[PDB]
């Protein structure tokens, strides 16, 4: 599941504050972030395949 | 998409730290300090490094030296008086 990786994840940014040079490190973990959200709302979105041809 | 790879390069927040500078004073400085030495007052010692023990000491700012010097003083011309006489 995408909670492990967001735990860490977002502990690793809180992290990345004691140090700098997570200029593009973070953003990296924004995409991440993004592309993973979008799994899960594509996850949502699906219908099976094939029609309904009981009613239909 | 991946995390970049700076985080896992430390070298610039090790010799980056202004406290390195005095690290590397007390690794010497201290480190290299007999926690203890050898003796205050021993200067002249034939028992008059007894004489600096009890009067020269740090130990004591007491009068008695001072005193015993002046009656010095006062029993080498008197006594050059009396040499005179």
């Known amino acids: 599941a995408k909670s ?3 735990k860490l994840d977002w502990a690793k940014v809180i992290s990345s504050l004691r140090i700098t040079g997570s200029t ?3 953003l990296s973990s924004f ?4 592309d993973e959200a979008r799994r899960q709302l594509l ?8 029609v309904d041809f009981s009613h239909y | 998409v991946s995390t970049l790879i700076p985080p896992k390069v430390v070298s610039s927040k090790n010799i980056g730290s202004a406290p390195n500078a005095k690290r590397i004073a007390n690794v010497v400085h201290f480190y290299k ?6 003796a205050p007052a021993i200067k002249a010692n034939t028992r008059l490094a007894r004489y600096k023990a009890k009067y020269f000491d740090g130990d004591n700012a007491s009068g008695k030296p001072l ?11 008197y006594s050059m008086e009396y040499y005179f006489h």
């Open chain 1, 31 to 34: 995409k991440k972030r993004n």
């Open chain 1, 43 to 50: 996850e949502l979105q699906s219908q099976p395949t094939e």
């Open chain 1, 24 to 26: 593009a490190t973070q």
């Open chain 2, 67 to 77: 005193w015993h010097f002046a009656l010095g003083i006062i029993a080498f011309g």
């Open chain 1, 4 to 6: 492990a990786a967001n």
């Open chain 2, 33 to 38: 300090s007999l926690p203890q030495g050898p």
